[PDB]
């Protein structure tokens, strides 16, 4: 059936997200939490919005004549925590390393770290957006 084909598409996508290392056990636990029916889709939507917002706030801080490195570090820590909670482990590990550049008070190191944050966020956002579209069709 059409429904069965979409289910297999979604299973295939989720399996590749885990097998490629993009998500960890915390993401598996979101699926357990849901077992509210669109819970995971809403969590993922909000995470995409929030991460994108925080990445942009960090970028802005790093554009200032004087960089407030304590506030950079605090925003990175927030993103680390939200990423951990959805299972976005690569974004999480990049945030962990990112603290050292705040301690070094290196604007250029923070900028290079934020570019890696974007790389890992966009890789996962890609798979999340495809998941959302599949989830939408399945829920129809």
UniProtKB/Swiss-Prot annotation:
Pfam families: Hpt. Disruption phenotype: Dwarf, narrow leaf, small grain and low fertility phenotypes. One of its GO terms (cellular component) is cytosol. GO terms for biological process: cytokinin-activated signaling pathway; phosphorelay signal transduction system; positive regulation of cytokinin-activated signaling pathway. Transmembrane segments: none annotated. Disulfide bonds: none annotated. Residues 36-140 form the HPt domain. Gene3D superfamilies: HPT domain. Widely expressed. Two-component system major event consists of a His-to-Asp phosphorelay between a sensor histidine kinase (HK) and a response regulator (RR). In plants, the His-to-Asp phosphorelay involves an additional intermediate named Histidine-containing phosphotransfer protein (HPt). This multistep phosphorelay consists of a His-Asp-His-Asp sequential transfer of a phosphate group between first a His and an Asp of the HK protein, followed by the transfer to a conserved His of the HPt protein and finally the transfer to an Asp in the receiver domain of the RR protein. The keyword Nucleus applies. The keyword Zinc does not apply. The modification Phosphohistidine is found at residue 77. PROSITE patterns: HPT. It comes from the Eukaryota. Its main location: cytoplasm. It is found in: Cytoplasm, Cytosol; Nucleus. Functions as a two-component phosphorelay mediators between cytokinin sensor histidine kinases and response regulators (B-type ARRs). Plays an important role in propagating cytokinin signal transduction through the multistep His-to-Asp phosphorelay. Functions as a positive regulator of the cytokinin signaling pathway. May play a regulatory role in salt and drought tolerance during plant development. Plant silencing simultaneously OHP1 and OHP2 exhibit phenotypes for a deficiency in cytokinin signaling, including dwarfism with reduced internode lengths, enhanced lateral root growth, early leaf senescence, and reduced tiller numbers and fertility. Histidine-containing phosphotransfer domain (HPt) contains an active histidine that mediates the phosphotransfer. This is Histidine-containing phosphotransfer protein 2. It comes from Oryza sativa subsp. japonica (Rice).
